[PDB]
Design a protein around this ligand. Structure first.
Ligand SMILES: [Cl-]
Ligand SMILES: [Cl-]
Ligand SMILES: [Mg+2]
Ligand SMILES: [Mg+2]
Length: 285
């Protein structure tokens, strides 16, 4: 034991001992297991990108769809932090209408995308938003229209403004799309600093406010990178809210989060990064 924050000491002690992979295995072994029956139904086979990544039945988002209410998406509700997120897979070509249906129904203001459509030659996500202002998208199945209004491209991420219209009612909403383009699969962001700039931009937008529905967060499978993002955010929230900042047990927060969706944080290095981002981020809270 060393005495000279509680979070920082844990980190150094873990980093010296090199037990990230071990602690990460603890989390894996200790993680909740709940059924995903609806997800495994034969008729939902083509709504899942990966057959080993499913939403738990209890926390899955249901489409207000007359036909089939299933989407591979989970509500993560963090009670003390008072923040909610929808974590979802990268939409598939046949589930883009569902994806935007969910955004609409859940009254989300932001979408946070943590992957690229193509990574190392592999398709990770459908092109679910318009890349060009002049070519808008219509989703006929769910009766939605989607138009790129503007985009602000930076080195490590892009922010877009989209206009989502419910064609039935002709209501329109502005959705903000926060796209971190330099976070490789099973990897970590280019640096904690760039990650936190991104996070603070999402926050400053008001997208994570209780005034709106839960932000929709996705990567490819909606667990590794998305898990890292949310865990960092929630931990920083708890530090601000609590009289004791150093009381925030990152491992325990992650396990709580894992009660709502499987596999959040997919490598030991992502775990390490999340600790790192929270410590560095704590300065700015
Ligand atoms: Cl919480
Ligand atoms: Cl695809
Ligand atoms: Mg419930
Ligand atoms: Mg143009």
């Amino acid at each position: 034991n060393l005495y000279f924050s509680e979070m920082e000491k844990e980190f150094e002690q873990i980093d010296k001992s090199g037990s990230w992979a071990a602690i990460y295995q603890d989390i894996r072994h200790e993680a909740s297991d709940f059924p995903c029956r609806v997800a495994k139904l034969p008729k939902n086979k083509n709504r899942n990108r990966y057959r080993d990544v499913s939403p738990f039945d209890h926390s899955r988002i249901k489409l207000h769809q007359e036909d089939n209410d299933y989407i591979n998406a989970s509500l993560i509700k963090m009670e003390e932090a008072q923040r909610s997120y929808i974590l979802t897979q990268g939409p598939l070509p046949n589930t883009c209408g569902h994806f935007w249906e969910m955004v609409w129904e859940q009254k989300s203001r932001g979408v946070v995308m943590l992957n690229r459509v193509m990574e190392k030659g592999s398709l990770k996500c459908a092109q679910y938003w318009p890349q060009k202002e002049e070519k808008e998208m219509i989703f006929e199945d769910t009766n939605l229209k989607l138009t790129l209004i503007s985009e602000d491209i930076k080195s490590y991420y892009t922010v877009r403004q989209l206009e989502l219209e419910n064609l039935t009612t002709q209501e329109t909403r502005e959705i903000l799309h926060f796209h971190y383009t330099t976070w490789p699969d099973f990897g970590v962001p280019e640096s904690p600093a760039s990650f936190l700039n991104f996070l603070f931009k999402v926050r400053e937008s008001g997208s994570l406010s209780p005034e709106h529905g839960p932000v929709v967060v996705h990567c490819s499978a909606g667990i590794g990178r998305s898990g890292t993002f949310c865990l960092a955010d929630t931990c920083l929230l708890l530090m601000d809210k609590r009289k004791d900042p150093s009381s925030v047990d990152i491992k325990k927060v992650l396990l709580e989060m894992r009660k709502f969706r499987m596999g959040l944080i997919q490598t030991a290095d992502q775990l390490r990064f999340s600790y790192l981002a929270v410590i560095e981020g704590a300065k700015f809270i």
